[PDB]
Amino acid sequence: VPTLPLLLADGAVLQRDQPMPVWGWSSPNAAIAVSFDGKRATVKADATGQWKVRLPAHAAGGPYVLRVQGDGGELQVRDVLVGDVWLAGGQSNMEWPLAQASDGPQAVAAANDAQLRQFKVPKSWSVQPQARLTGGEWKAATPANAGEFTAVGYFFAKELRASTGVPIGIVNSTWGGSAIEAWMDAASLGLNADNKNQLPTLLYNQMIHPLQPFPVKGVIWYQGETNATDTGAVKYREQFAAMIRQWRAERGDKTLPFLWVQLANFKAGGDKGELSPWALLRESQSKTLALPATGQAVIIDIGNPTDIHPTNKRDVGHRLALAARHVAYGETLVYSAPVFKRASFDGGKAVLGFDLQGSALQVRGGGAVQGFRIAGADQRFHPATAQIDGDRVIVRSDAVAAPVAVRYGWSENPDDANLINRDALPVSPFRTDTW
Ligand SMILES: [Zn+2]
Ligand SMILES: [Zn+2]
Ligand SMILES: [Zn+2]
Ligand SMILES: [Zn+2]
Ligand SMILES: [Zn+2]
Ligand SMILES: [Zn+2]
Ligand SMILES: [Zn+2]
After folding, report:
1. What is the spatial distance between Cα 180 and Cα 199, in angstroms, rounded to a whole number?
2. Which residues hold their Cβ within 5 A of ligand 2, which is an ion?
């Protein structure tokens, strides 16, 4: 009488268009048969009692029944869809449930999609990497269930349902207040294999590692507030890149799409002088775009100055889905605002070159450009004026005759910064210096 992992249960969404692993346990050397939509595979478990087959790549569809057959009896897994599965991780703002979004009641009331599903990994930890989850089931996006979906993940999935027309499943693996070190395996930290959600490897071991044989289309991520500190904001860029590369290596896919949300604006109290840990962390996030198959949603226009938990999650999901459509689905569209590329300082002016990313630079509210500061060699930054000229912005200040650096939206709460494109996507904060 065989058993299956918690992910291969009633209502599951399985990753389409790549090999389909089915694994589980039984008696040692037990004979096992697995069938799915008229395909059958047999295998013998090993002396541990573990068994695994790979079923052919299957196109989007469903519902189907996954049958597993041993000599003791049969397991039937019902209402299985085949589509795209996305892993959704991070801390509070990915955990944030749909019911508590700005549109929560109305969005839950509109959530009537049997082909959009979530698997909520329970908050759990372990000092060692684990082969099994300790809980969780698949729920479809009905009004009875959708209130508990990740708000950002639901809205992201709702966008993909419309652009792909295939089933979407979200594996929700989140924990409010967590540090990235808790989500990283021992190796990415240089380690051997208090609040536990801030301790190295403890969440990865129980909430990520067991998921890794389950194929996914890509990952969406919203984390970093906890690491936006004097000590961890810059080194986050190396930790985050290492985390992505390791998750990817574990899954055997060095270009597995990995998308994240840059921190929103928040009066975090960390800014002092020209030091801004939150702006340093956002930079660490933007630098990670150097890795292949990555994208970033910028959201400094929709944070809450006075609450680290902004309730506008619909627009977060919209911008992650733009990026997913480019990075994971190979589509051409405006998925990013213009990106700063190059700076030249001649005269009393700085000219900044942007990659326009398929759009045009404009200004929220239509007035003068806000959010720029400029510094001389003394490294003191003054407010500056800025003018748009196609793919360039020219920046200057009456009080800086020999500028050497420019900073745009470089603070924890850059709620004035107003450079956008014609689709109203905001330009990411940035700086020209490495001070
Ligand atoms: Zn399991
Ligand atoms: Zn392992
Ligand atoms: Zn809050
Ligand atoms: Zn949208
Ligand atoms: Zn690209
Ligand atoms: Zn140019
Ligand atoms: Zn203001």
Report:
1. 9
2. 129
Amino acid letter, 35: S
Say if 432 falls within a structural domain. Answer: no
Q: Cα–Cα distance between 63 and 34 in angstroms, integer? A: 17
CA of 401 to the centre of ligand 4 (A): 44
Report how many domains make up the chain: 3
My answer on whether 368 and 411 are in the same domain is: yes
Ligand nearest to the CA of 308: 3
- Encoded tokens for 191: 């380690």
Query: Are residues 37 and 144 located together in one domain of the fold?
Result: no
In the reported structure, the alpha carbon of residue 354 is separated from the centroid of ligand 7 by a whole-number distance in angstroms of 25
Peptide bond into 210 cis (omega under 30): no
In a domain, 4, yes or no: no
Tell how far the Cα of 128 is from the centroid of ligand 2, in angstroms: 9
Q: How far is the CA of 153 from the centre of ligand 3 (A)?
A: 18
- The DSSP H or E segment spanning 355 is strand 349-355
What is the C-alpha R_g of the chain?
Answer: 24
Header resolution in angstroms: 1.9
Ligand 7 centroid to 417 CA: how many Å?
9
Q: How far apart are CA 363 and CA 252, in angstroms?
A: 43
| Tokens at 221, concatenated | 């991520």
What residue numbers bound the domain in which 29 lies?
A: 13-80
- Residue 2 belongs to some domain of the structure: no
Please give the distance, rounded to the nearest whole angstrom, from the Cα atom of residue 326 to the centre of ligand 5. Answer: 6
